[PDB]
From a paper:
To obtain a deeper understanding of the mechanism of [name] inhibition by 1, we determined the co-crystal structure of 1 bound to [name] at a resolution of 2.62 Å. The co-crystal structure revealed that 1 is bound to the ATP-binding pocket, consistent with the ATP-competitive mechanism of inhibition. The 3′-OH group of 1 formed hydrogen bonds with the amide backbone of Glu81 and Leu83 in the hinge region of [name]. Notably, the hydrogen bond with Glu81 is unusually short, 2.6 Å, suggesting its energetic favorability. The structure also revealed key hydrogen bond interactions between the 4-OH and the 9’-carbonyl with Asp86 and Asp145, respectively. These critical contacts in the ATP-binding pocket with the 4-OH, as well as the 9′-carbonyl, explain the potency differences observed with the intermediate/shunt metabolites produced by BGC HX1012/HX1035. Indeed, the binding mode of 1 was similar to that of dinaciclib despite sharing no chemical similarity or conserved pharmacophore-protein interactions. We characterize the activity of 1, revealing it as a potent ATP-competitive inhibitor of [name] (Kiapp of 44 nM) with selectivity for CDK family kinases which induces G1 phase cell cycle arrest. Epimerization of the 4-OH in 1 to afford 12 results in a 50-fold reduction in potency. Consistent with this prediction, 11 is approximately 900-fold less active than 1.
Author numbering: 2 to 36, 47 to 150, 163 to 297
């Protein structure tokens, strides 16, 4: 093959990922080797936006599926773990969040959903830019970033499932701690309820008719938000609480969130990566 596999960079759910070199172009790429979908996947090649990792080639040869992506060196999770002692500067936080929303706003306007948006698959660079990886393919794994409508067994997700995840990552960058670090579907769901209170028909019309909603859930009270994400300012908390509305239809759109006053003073600073 016209691909020379430098080294393995991770295992996925259907295939493995390699850093590779395209023998034609001398082009360094992320290469996913997996063992109707091919047609549905191929469409993501058309998505071109500065905050989407580019899907370069979908190869279906030797009855096998290779996906080739734009390569980047570091993911947000490594950059969070590295920036643990000092914490990410708020201007860099604000930049990444504004950028990720422009990506979601782009994906959503083309009817494209991530579903499993988490820090591991947010890639960064020396220009101080952040890109969405593994976007629109999905169509033990951590549940830390799973929307409450998924955990309650809704089959028919909307774009609001990704706004939730971004809100969780925003909190994590600010606090240096997963917001809802759950270790089972019930544990995850109960961690959200311990912070935002158990939902009801008042705040979430339909919630009692969800597939996996029990009337036998405990009734927890909502926690004040200055205790959850300090010392984030009132704009940040305001934007976070609109991103974490229980009711997906009340949950703020990526487009609407770009016009939030939190981004009035937004800049593009440049990180120190190793
Ligand atoms: C550091 O990046 C990793 C290895 C990341 O630790 C990780 O968790 C997985 C599973 C990856 O998977 C990827 O598929 C991936 C894609 C689509 C593009 C890309 O440029 C890169 C570099 C990719 O590697 C990432």
């Amino acid at each position: 093959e016209n691909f020379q596999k430098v080294e393995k960079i991770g295992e996925g759910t259907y295939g493995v990922v390699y850093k590779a070199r395209n023998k034609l172009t001398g082009e360094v790429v992320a290469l996913k080797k997996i063992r109707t979908a091919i047609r549905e996947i191929s469409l993501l090649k058309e998505l071109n936006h500065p905050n989407i990792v580019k899907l370069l080639d979908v190869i279906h040869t030797e009855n096998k599926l290779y996906l080739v992506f734009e390569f980047l060196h570091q993911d947000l999770k490594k950059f969070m773990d590295a920036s643990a002692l000092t914490g990410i500067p708020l201007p860099l936080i604000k930049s990444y969040l504004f950028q990720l929303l422009q990506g979601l706003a782009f994906c959503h306007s083309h009817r494209v959903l991530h579903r499993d948006l988490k820090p591991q698959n947010l890639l960064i660079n020396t220009e101080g830019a952040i890109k969405l990886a593994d976007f629109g393919l999905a169509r033990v794994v951590t549940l830390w970033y799973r929307a409450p409508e998924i955990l309650l067994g809704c089959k028919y997700y909307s774009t609001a499932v990704d706004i939730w995840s971004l809100g969780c990552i925003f909190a994590e960058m600010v606090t240096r701690r997963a917001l809802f670090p759950g270790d089972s579907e019930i544990d995850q769901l109960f961690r959200i309820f311990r912070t935002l209170g158990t939902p009801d028909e008042v705040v979430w019309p339909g919630v009692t008719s969800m597939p996996d909603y029990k009337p036998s859930f405990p009734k927890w009270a909502r926690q004040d938000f200055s205790k959850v994400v300090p010392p984030l300012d009132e704009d940040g908390r305001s934007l976070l609480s609109q991103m974490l509305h229980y009711d997906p239809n009340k949950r703020i759109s990526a487009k609407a969130a770009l016009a939030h006053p939190f981004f009035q003073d937004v800049t593009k600073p440049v990180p120190h990566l190793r």
